[PDB]
């Protein structure tokens, strides 16, 4: 608003200079006629004598230079002393801004450009990593999973923030690189300008900033969910087959409780009661609880695993699987039988070859998919993704609402306040700007919420690790690792730079301290990219495999 204030004040000087000159009386001697040499207002000045008027009030630094004067010599010929190329000349040397400030401004110009190249590099490489991470997740078709969908949207917010910062600095060069042509050029520059673009981009940055906070809260929320929701082999079959606490009868006629646990093949239901008592060690009349059923089911899986290892066709594939995909195999040996699953020769081969995508396509081309498409969809997903995601209730719709809905509630009201009451420069102003808190409240609330869930997560992770419940190979541990590093990585940054950026006094020290914070935070995109994509073992494996199929393709054949 300094360029805007000065052009308005100079036009005012220009207008009221002509009026002030009109009311002057006609001369009585040889005089230099009343003029406005576009810089100052000159009255009728007698020949030889030098005129002196106070510095023009339209100047931004008028407050300081207030008492000084501008001079102009009137020639002995009656016309004003002209310049070298016959131009309007005057001595406004003592109306100029402080020589000390011009040198200091030349120094701030160097550091603003020096700091710009540095953070532009940081933002460029963190954005580059992000686009590559989104390309990888997307390309490998791994964006189906609830975890990856969250990561992609977290990446999208870090893309938006980083990219809108570069657009703002880019537009600021484009605008201020322009030359002061004429008064028409200035009028076109201020009024009919792309100052709107600057501000549209600022809104995307503000939204970027808050959405970053929200998408990191949903990471903590999704993890807090996964850890509590401890899905196992028993849980998937309690869904697929169903738990039956009372004494039921199997399809063949014989008595069977829980998840198809046979007691006696004979039709004697009275004798079956005495057989059930042998397992737990006490009388139950014919009904067992959840803890009794899952302890008894863990014998069925131990018995089914034994058989799979004794089977020459199933043992090669079984060993080349993780604990989750093994559960999907043990699951279909429960519905199909041991000899039945051994029939999936082609599918089992590619499931051993880790070709999860094409394995899932021909497993769906099976006669088994047609008979039970519901149960097949879930186990086919478990083989494709290596996660219990198909057997867990997703809150993904909520997560989009938290991640993108919540910043929406505060950025657009802010953008309205900004539009009416604080429509100045580029709108990027973040702290102690009056109604700064409109955008700070949602982030304060997200760090506060994200703090309490972190503690709950670490409390429940320590407990689950001490109870040998979670093994260092389970995908939940691997996800827990990258999430529980990112949260204290970003958390500590906030705490530290709250003391580092305590420099309130305007200068180069303040500017470098401001730069220190923003520079270290420019790499954040690269952090989320490595943690949620590049360090992912499954992503690393798929890329390694798709590269070896390329190494055989264009080298051996072509």
């Amino acid at each position: 608003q300094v360029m805007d204030f000065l052009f308005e004040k100079w036009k005012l000087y220009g207008d009221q200079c002509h009026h002030n000159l009109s009311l002057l009386p006609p001369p009585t001697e040889l005089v230099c006629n009343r003029t406005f040499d576009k810089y100052s207002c000159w009255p009728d000045t007698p020949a030889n004598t030098t005129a002196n008027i106070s510095c023009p009030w339209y100047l931004p630094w008028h407050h300081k230079v207030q008492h000084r004067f501008v001079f102009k010599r009137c020639g002995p010929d009656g016309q004003w002393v002209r310049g070298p190329r016959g131009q309007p000349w005057r001595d406004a040397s003592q109306c100029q801004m402080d020589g000390e400030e011009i040198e200091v401004q030349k120094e701030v110009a160097k550091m603003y450009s020096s700091f710009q190249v540095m953070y532009t590099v940081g933002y460029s490489l963190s954005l580059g990593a992000l686009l590559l991470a989104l390309a990888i997740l997307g390309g490998l078709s791994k964006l189906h999973c609830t975890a990856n969908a969250i990561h992609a949207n977290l990446f999208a917010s870090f893309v938006l923030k980083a990219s809108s910062v570069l657009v703002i600095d880019g537009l600021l060069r484009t605008r201020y690189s322009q030359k002061i042509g004429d008064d028409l050029s200035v009028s076109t520059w201020l009024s009919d300008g792309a100052v709107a673009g600057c501000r549209v981009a600022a809104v995307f940055m503000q939204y970027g900033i808050v959405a970053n906070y929200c998408w990191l809260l949903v990471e903590g929320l999704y993890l807090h969910n996964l850890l509590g929701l401890a899905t196992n082999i028993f849980e998937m079959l309690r869904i697929d087959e169903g738990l039956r606490l009372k004494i039921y009868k199997d399809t063949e006629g014989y008595y069977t409780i829980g998840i198809g646990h046979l007691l006696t093949k004979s039709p004697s239901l009275n004798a079956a009661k005495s057989e059930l008592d042998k397992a737990i060690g006490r009388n139950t009349n014919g009904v067992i609880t959840k803890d009794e059923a899952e302890k008894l089911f863990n014998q069925d899986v131990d018995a089914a695993v034994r058989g799979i290892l004794r089977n020459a066709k199933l043992k090669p594939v079984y060993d080349s699987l993780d604990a989750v995909r093994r559960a999907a195999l043990i699951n279909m040996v429960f519905q199909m039988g041991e000899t039945g699953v051994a029939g999936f020769t082609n599918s089992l081969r590619m499931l051993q070859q880790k070709r999860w995508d094409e394995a899932a396509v021909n497993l769906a081309k099976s006669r088994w998919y047609n008979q039970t498409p519901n149960r097949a969809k879930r186990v086919i997903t478990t083989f494709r993704t290596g996660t219990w995601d198909a057997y867990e209730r997703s809150f993904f719709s909520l997560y989009l609402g938290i991640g993108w809905g919540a910043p929406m509630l505060f950025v657009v009201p802010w953008a309205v306040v900004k539009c009416l009451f604080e429509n100045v420069q580029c709108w990027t102003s973040n702290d102690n700007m009056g109604f700064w808190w409109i955008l700070r409240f949602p982030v304060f609330l997200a760090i506060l919420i994200n703090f309490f869930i972190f503690v709950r997560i670490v409390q429940l992770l320590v407990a689950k690790l001490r109870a040998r419940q979670m093994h260092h190979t389970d995908y939940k541990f691997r996800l827990a690792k990258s999430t529980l590093t990112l949260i204290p990585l970003l958390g500590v940054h906030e705490v530290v730079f709250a003391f580092v950026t305590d420099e309130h006094a305007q200068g180069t020290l303040r500017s470098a301290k401001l730069f220190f914070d923003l520079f270290l935070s420019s790499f954040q995109g690269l952090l989320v990219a490595v943690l949620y994509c590049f360090l992912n073992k499954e992503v690393q494996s798929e890329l390694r495999r798709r590269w070896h199929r390329w190494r055989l393709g264009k080298v051996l054949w072509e």
């Binding site: 309007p88 002061i180 305007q506 935070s521």
Partner: peptide, 28 residues
């Protein structure tokens, strides 16, 4: 601090342009 830096920078660019308009008033 990004927004706060970009802010001070634009506050500067504007003040820098304002004095350069005064150079235009002094030369024409």
């Amino acid at each position: 601090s990004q927004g706060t830096f970009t802010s001070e920078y634009s506050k500067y660019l504007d003040s820098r342009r304002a004095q350069d308009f005064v150079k235009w008033l002094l030369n024409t």
